[PDB]
């Protein structure tokens, strides 16, 4: 019952029974070792405190959002300017002839 209690405290039984994974303990332990090695490598590559990571998850995402918005805007502006310049060159050649 203590294991049940701490399990439902970590994750509800309904949220953990919906997944379809094998029930053998060896593959579970191997996947746990793999994900621990992966998170250790991720922490050695780059990592900060939990609150800093949570704040960055929004700060840098808004940074990338505004950056890609400005990127799309300047891209469509450049495309419109390019086709307008092509039409202007065509009209200039027509006026020249």
Residues that bind other proteins (CB under 8 A): 26, 30, 33-34, 37-38, 41, 59-60, 62-63, 66, 70, 73-74, 77, 80-81, 84, 87-88, 91-92, 94-95
SS3 97: coil
CB of 62 to other proteins, least distance (A): 5
Considering the complex, state which of residue 7 and residue 32 has its C-beta at the smaller distance from other proteins. Answer: 32
User: 26-48 burial by CB neighbour count: b if 16+ within 10 A, else e?
Assistant: eeeeeeeeeeeeeeeeeeeeeee
CB of 18 to other proteins, least distance (A): 25
What is the Rg, in whole angstroms, of the alpha carbon atoms belonging to the chain?
A: 28
């Amino acid at each position: 019952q203590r294991q049940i209690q701490n399990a439902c405290a970590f994750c509800s039984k309904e949220r953990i029974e919906n997944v379809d994974l094998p029930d053998t303990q060896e593959e579970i332990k191997r996947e746990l070792d793999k994900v621990s090695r992966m998170i250790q490598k991720a922490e050695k590559s780059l990592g900060l405190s939990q609150e800093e990571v949570i704040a960055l998850f929004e700060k840098c995402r808004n940074k990338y959002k505004e950056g890609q918005k400005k990127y799309m805007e300047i891209d469509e502006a450049l495309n419109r300017l390019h086709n307008s310049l092509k039409a202007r060159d065509q009209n200039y050649k027509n006026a020249e002839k």
